[PDB]
């Protein structure tokens, strides 16, 4: 776990899914999803998509272990939705690292 960087908090974005049922679900469940991401350092990556892919998997993983000690459970609708919001977040974290810092 000492190989990972941890980013500071961010506002979770609103994601749109193509149906009202999913849009309402997301917005009603989104507080259960992460608002910070885990990543590997930038100097290991050639391109943005590879960083985003790892950041996504690392972050989902830690979040699913942290919160099943809590006593949360995730449906598969929740893991798909985390996949989408965490991707966006990993993208923002990449832009923080490379432009803003």
């Amino acid at each position: 776990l000492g190989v990972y960087m941890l980013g500071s908090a961010m506002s979770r974005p609103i994601i749109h899914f193509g149906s009202d049922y999913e849009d309402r679900y997301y917005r009603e469940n989104m507080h259960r999803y992460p608002n910070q991401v885990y990543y590997r350092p930038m100097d290991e990556y050639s391109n943005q998509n590879n960083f985003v892919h790892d950041c996504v998997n690392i972050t989902i993983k830690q979040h699913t272990v942290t919160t099943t000690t809590k006593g949360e459970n995730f449906t598969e609708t929740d893991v798909k939705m985390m996949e989408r919001v965490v991707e966006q977040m990993c993208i923002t974290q990449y832009e923080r690292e490379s432009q803003a810092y």
Partner: antibody
Amino acid sequence: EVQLQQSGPELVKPGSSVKISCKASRNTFTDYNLDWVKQSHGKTLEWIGNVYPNNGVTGYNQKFRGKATLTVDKSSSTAYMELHSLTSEDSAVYYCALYYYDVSYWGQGTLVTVSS
Amino acid sequence: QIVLTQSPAIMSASPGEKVTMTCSASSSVSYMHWYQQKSGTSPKRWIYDTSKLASGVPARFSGSGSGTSYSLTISSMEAEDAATYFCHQWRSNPYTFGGGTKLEIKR
């Protein structure tokens, strides 16, 4: 093939409370949403709150906080609405409504009459 | 509390007529839903996600709209369609309904 059965009509005294049930039968959805809606005197519809019965999550209309409490017995697929401290304006027909993407089912409603 | 306003409140139409009723939002919603309720029965979802017909809803119904203006159309009014129609939004808490259009048929 899924159906919602609600409990029967209640006559309650003002000041008391009541609890109504909505049981989902022959259901096979993992994560669906259950809304509760009130109808007063044959017309006006108001949303009270919702529960996702398969893990935890519960929403309220501000106007009904302190008045409704939503819970679920997910062993028997039954969802409950507690109504606290009733008065005459709580006399109404109460509905549970199931939603899962395209699919929607409404219960036949529970008539609550608040009277001495 | 997005307010939904439906007009007209009462409407009469002849068999065969094209009927349109409108639901207007005080702010933008992405999607609108419509319910039918006849006397004695509980509301039933009629159109969802603005233009999709629920199961067992006849083809002569259609929905459209964007932003703050949404409508429900019946291309050919039939006696069975006499009822009250409500719109409803899930854009933000609290989810609200319109006050209904009551549709009657001339005979």
